[PDB]
Design a binder for this molecule. Sequence first.
Ligand SMILES: [Cl-]
Ligand SMILES: [Cl-]
Ligand SMILES: [Mg+2]
Ligand SMILES: [Mg+2]
Lengths: 126, 128
Amino acid sequence: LPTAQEVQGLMARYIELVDVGDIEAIVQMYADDATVEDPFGQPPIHGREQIAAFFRQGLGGGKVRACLTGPVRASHNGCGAMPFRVEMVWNGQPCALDVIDVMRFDEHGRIQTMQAYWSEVNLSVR
Amino acid sequence: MNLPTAQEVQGLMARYIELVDVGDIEAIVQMYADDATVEDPFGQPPIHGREQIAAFFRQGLGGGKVRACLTGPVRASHNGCGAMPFRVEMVWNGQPCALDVIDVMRFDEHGRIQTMQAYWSEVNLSVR
Ligand SMILES: [Cl-]
Ligand SMILES: [Cl-]
Ligand SMILES: [Mg+2]
Ligand SMILES: [Mg+2]
């Protein structure tokens, strides 16, 4: 499995691909066999058409920005969690959503599982 | 308490952090489920149950001198789970370091921690 140092760099790059709004580059970082539980507690999303309809529904348009708000934590078993924020729109205006994702990386370096922790309690209108 | 709402989580989890910082072990362990598991780190085999979890928090904390604080907001789900970022300041090899951590938890319907995963490694240490 990715080295912890490496799981870090796949996770900071991800915030990169999310932020520039490159949905296509976000959907190659995943596995055939992946789930998106986003937000965690919802069923999970799987299948490459499906997920890709997830990142398109959430980052299509451009107007979503996302940055790490502290360092990626990683393990030695190819996993890792990171804190970040997102600036987007809700109820017509500027909001922000605080987020931690946790990612499990398969033996090919692709997101085998991603889980995304947030809810309202992690929204601030601005 | 029952299965905690998102709001109550956040609250449960900030307190954990304070217990931690002060080093009240009995207290840390009574937040857990009698049969809870801890993986800390994540990637090393669970431990199961209050007796062993207590043995583990003594080993880390019992040295005194560890402090802890959140370094962002608690993130909480609607299914009794939250995740939080924090930093652990200790001493070691006589110098001050610090460790950066995200603890992922779930709770019960009784409001106690069923499970906890602690994401960190040796990549998350930083002996200023
Ligand atoms: Cl942080
Ligand atoms: Cl944060
Ligand atoms: Mg304190
Ligand atoms: Mg029980």
